[model samples]
Target chain A: ATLFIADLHLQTEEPEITAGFLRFLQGEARQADALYILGDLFEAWIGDDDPNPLHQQIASAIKAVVDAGVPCYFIHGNRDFLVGQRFARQSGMILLAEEERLDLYGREVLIMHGDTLCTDDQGYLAFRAKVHTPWIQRLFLALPLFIRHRIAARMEIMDVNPQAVVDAMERHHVQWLIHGHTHRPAVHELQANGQPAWRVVLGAWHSEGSMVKVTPDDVELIHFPFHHH
Target chain B: ATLFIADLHLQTEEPEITAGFLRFLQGEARQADALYILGDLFEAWIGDDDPNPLHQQIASAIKAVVDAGVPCYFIHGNRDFLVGQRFARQSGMILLAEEERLDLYGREVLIMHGDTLCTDDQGYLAFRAKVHTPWIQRLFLALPLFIRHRIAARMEIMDVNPQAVVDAMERHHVQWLIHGHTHRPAVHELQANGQPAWRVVLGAWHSEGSMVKVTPDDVELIHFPFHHH
Candidate 1:
């Protein structure tokens, strides 16, 4: 089976959530054929050069999962869009483009971090445009950590525009669309170019762990409670 | 030997240049191990969905090259940044990320379209930041061809900044960097992070074709006259 999870918002302050994610990596993730972390794996990535111990710990745990033979894939989330090749190498996770397509059990599925679909958020989109510029990103990374952290602290969703979702499905010619950003986890049935389609939303990890398990027969969205073990 | 060329600026008005490109593709390119069109293969690619006869002609010629077994790779140019998967598929050329690293005959080389290195072009950079936004690009593509063409005609170079070149070489840890955009064809020796490095600039295809030919022992910048057959 393939596993998908997102919006963990992992950070040092959330020890329990971090513990839960590490457990998921060692436990459920190890047993899966492949794992996909759609986005927000970090609360605020800042940049891969960051010396935060929390980042290193998570990378080590993820690297272990990859060593165990489960290929892990990641897409950038709004808060952690700064994750770079260094972090990807450390975690042994394959970095995917913002929007990617997959063929699963003879079904075509389109996946993304989900923020791009919120086309109605003009202000956030404008800010996104500025930060995404290569020079701007480079300049930001060159700044002192304290400045970066302060700027990061100052930084969600009017759920994805329905038309945007429809257009994505039509463009990718996929019947299944899966994303995480809205934090309102649910399955919505919709039509794309007159064909039936479905959108699966992955919820945020706050008090518990949320994931989607996909097999040849089913795609199950599962939530499990955090445990000390 | 592998061949690299860029800044063809192929367009309907320049039939001779297009002829030269096709001839190069059919003759010299077929004999080479690989071919890399660094950027600006077209004067202005508006979008992949464009029904321009010139685009189709070029795609067919490129597809023929691929069919003959020589691999072709392309990087986006400032004018042709809108070229998408459809064009890539049609041309049978692999699209590479902006900054791609390759191992060429045991030498680590970094390649780009060369626009990003113009850090001093603040106005151009700002315009680039706006257009590169995903949503902005989508909206532009949605416009009629006339508007896109009008916008495109309004679109480069104070040569690459010395510091930016050093930073790129250091970041990629590569001794060789090759790009086209400055249209200033030459080779320069420099240093990156205390190590010796070289930057190879490919000239624009104006009255003739400019190219970089690489072998295990040498890197040659060549200019060939455009001839009408």
Candidate 2:
């Protein structure tokens, strides 16, 4: 099966949840033709160097799944945009460019981290622009490791209480808009290309489990129970 | 029974997860004497003014928990320091300082996100300092939302790798250190205060469920299973 997934929120506070997914890796995920993880796998993506035992270990486990024959594709979320080529290489997957139109089972799908689409959130949109510049990225990354760390700490501190829109705009030209940043888990349908296109939200693996299974035949959203019980 | 709990990463990612936690609010969690949520209740907190469906919803639920004669205490995590008094007051939690010590269950324990101990990840440490500086924080807070958003976005591009030294000096001072930084699910035994000191690391509550439950008689670290069938 070709699997469409998003928002593993991998290494923030969800190990057993990640481990449960790991179990799927050793078992179910290995059977899939491909695994497309949209974004926010980590609460924040600090370069994929993943020297932390927490992330490195998860990367090691998933490496085996990729090794076993399944192709895994990773995209960056607002948190994990720093998920670099180095980490991608370390984790054994090709990093999908952030915003791209692609063919999935003959569906002309426009997929991204969803943060890119929340234009109404002016504050967020503005933030998105400044941080994504190549020169800024270079300057920030070139800093001594300690300085970079200081920047991330400062950034995350400011991020602690971000401006959450009272209600987010769900579907904008929904030709299969699958994303996980906002963490709303549902399939939203709207008119796109004169047809009913769906914008699917990938729920976090936190309080409950959510995954979108997209086979060539159809797209199904399922909720796994909370607490990984 | 009194439950000493920590690490509820309650972002509005999975509604089912939120629903499940809400169900807990209606059931087991209601009757507890107190709820000690160590930190990282949200994926990325951002700021005080940021409001979302889930934040309001959880605030109401927690207010109910507080209404039930239970006091809730919240400690800031690396991911949620931006959590302000507004949300806490609304949610019926008393926010705490980063390295503040708390006496719980007849023991004097120090609580933190545990990022400070990770001097090995010198990069993140420096970022922590810069953002956390009182003057810098005030400046960011005073900036227009547009400007602030821009800064946060730029920081994300720098890419970081967060880690902590398990054997570093003063990483664990031993009276009791309970924290979640690297998102590892672990509990350590250390010699502190000339006694066998214990460091309980609260795992993130995302992919899997890892919690540190404390009681007068015992402290239990739990990792719930995800897929049984």
Candidate 3:
């Protein structure tokens, strides 16, 4: 089976970007045998609470696609780690661990968001450290929802120039990593785990579209010119 | 017979404050005959399709609540004037016009998010003027989502510290208006239409909690303590 994944910025708090994603889901993703969301799936997600409309519709739409016999899996991106089991249940999709070793084309293709590789952008790495810590996240989330909103807004401001983060991601394994928090979309062959692997960086949906498609025969780093539909 | 609103901040985003608002909704508004959302409803809601998870959940939850007979009514605030009908439908809320009159509290009181009164905050007033214009908002909503996201973020950041803004609001008859969006919850008696009309401003849900409750007898301002459930 092939792995079809892109940074589907579902509720990105961006208008045209979200519209593009919505259109993509309604049109293209429905045909995929299996869809792997490569993270950064949202701009910021507080929880799976039913109070949100855009997100709820996105969730419902994703569910509708999943019901079509295509399995949908989500790996939370840096921006949307708050997306939890509540949303998973509401959206009816399975949540995968941060790293997954998938059997792709007879190879043990390990897939990840690749944020861990960026150790130099000390600021983001620190944030990544904190966000990954269950207790820290629990404490953070456990605070009043209003505080979380402020903190999340603060975090968004921090992600201003993600290319810095992307540069850090490149230093890790000159070879194999496909990730999308930096909004820099490119494909690279780098060395990782003592072997040569491709480091494929993804981009945000707001700009011209980018995707990394892994088929049994070949890989396509296709850029689809995005336009308002 | 209850109205639950948080995150109004007139136009600032504070989750705790918003949460406090959400908490109020859960605690006091769940079973009310009707929940009146008095606007700002967001730090700055632009287009019902903002696609922010926070907006989505707020809309859906209110929709669910309204569906349960606890009907909801939404009025626009200066920061959220762009919250159009599309989003209102998505949130399952009935969006009311800015100057639309509501017979609330046994009085033919007008319901407004009250940003127009921040006339004293001239800088914000200019920004508000720009945002309110159909062409400008359409252009804003049409821009690259990422670019717009940054602009929106900057607008929020600049407005968070409203020292300059409050004065303008005060001068423009906006201070003495019943509003939420500045995050400073206060009740002031001001002259309106040549009579004393109490302007109750709802505080931000980020830190200290503030809300305005209207009963048959009086409109009470309840400041929620910091301790949370």
Candidate 4:
């Protein structure tokens, strides 16, 4: 019924992955009823005002998919948390919350960027606590653009923890949780107490492209093999 | 109608200024209906989790003043831009935008941190355009505490341009403007294309303390002699 993708890390530096993603959107995602991007759509989104031609090209591509009658939704990844209203508008994407619930095929499916699952990484958690604050974000945005871009490039990346995921799944009574952040993508079939749950980790498009195809009866994680240009 | 202060550059290293500010809050500010702190109440605000005893003590002192009923408003300065909601809430102060407008005693008054009026400083202006972005601020805040603290200390300070100030006053059709960041305290009465205007620059509390007392009748910038504790 829908196509899901995450962790493309779409920087101009990796044109092959970008091309692959564009092809996927036009080929596969165009046919799906909906397209859900879990997180990490960009390498480092300094701000919406970034006059990078690369960002403009990607935004137009996403806009194309949205105009084709496919609803596209984006959740913030750690690297691109600065993607605010302007970016969403330009990309023609509906911004989703960090934690979202989708009624997929009569089942409750939990969605996130997957960073929260890496709760075990205390350093990351603490770092998240600082940057995520409204004031801190505002201050950072108030800095010079190139300095911001440079800092964003050098920012520390994060990961997820298992128990926290299980706890979230149990609390929400959801059987499926989908996310991307760790870049180590795999399907995790977990049990929280007596409840059965499935955690889908979306793969990074570092050397290859990855996505999830979901229907009422099928949920498939598909990888697109590509040649770097 | 209100009291105005800025550029205290509050730091434990400068104990006399802190003591003077506290005294000002208790003495001059207590009875005022409103207090507008233009900017730079701190030397460096590396996130509210700074763990600096001075910050905690100042927050508590400010909180005490707020409890006594004088409303406090804060606009961030370059050095202390990292001060977020945690600090605001702790001090019971409202955070304000960089540029603000007020109808003070039947006259229109423009207020800002004053950095924006520094039209001559092209390098700083370009830097200002970048860091003021939401994404850049988030990136800076995400760095290690020590790193952020150091960066704040080493940041370039800015001042205002007279022509730019006059242009803004004319455009806004406001006759009065008040600000701080230049650390120069003075009142200038000037004419822009036959229109009369006033610009009040607040002084820094580097070695001493200064504040402006505003009533329905007159406006006065006052200096306080202090003995460093």
lDDT of each: 0.84, 0.62, 0.59, 0.78
Q: Kindly report which residue stretches of model 4 are placed more than 4 angstroms away from their true locations once superposed.
A: A153-159, A227-229, B1-229
lDDT of 1 by residue, A37-143 (tens): 99999988789888999999999999999999999999999888999999989999999999999887776789899999999999889988988899999999999
Q: Can you give the DockQ of every candidate in the order shown?
A: 0.01, 0.02, 0.01, 0.01
Clashes per candidate (backbone, < 3 Å): 0, 35, 44, 21
Highest-TM-score candidate? 1
Q: Which sections of candidate 1 miss by over 4 Å?
A: B1-229
Candidates by TM-score, descending order: 1, 4, 2, 3
TM-scores of the candidates are 0.50, 0.46, 0.44, 0.48
In candidate 1, residue B155 scores what lDDT?
61
What is the TM-score of model 4 when looking only at chain B? 0.91
How well does chain A score by TM in each candidate? 0.96, 0.84, 0.81, 0.93
Q: Write the per-residue lDDT of candidate 4 for residues B1-229, one digit (tens) a residue.
A: 5988899988877886788788777776888888999889988776887899998888888888889988899998876777899999999999998888887787678888888888888987788788778799898889998887677665545557778888878877786788889986666667654765667777788544666666664555554344222
The sequence of per-residue lDDT tens digits that candidate 4 reaches over residues A1-229 is 6878898888878887789788778777888989988888998877788898988898899899999989999999887888888888988999989998898887678889988788878877798888889999998888999889788665534556678988888888887788888876555667865855677777788545667666665554554344222
TM-score of chain B, candidates 1 onward in order: 0.95, 0.80, 0.75, 0.91
| Cα DockQ of the candidate 1 complex | 0.01
Pick the DockQ winner.
Answer: 2
Docking class of 4: incorrect
Q: What is the lDDT of residue A50 in candidate 1?
A: 88
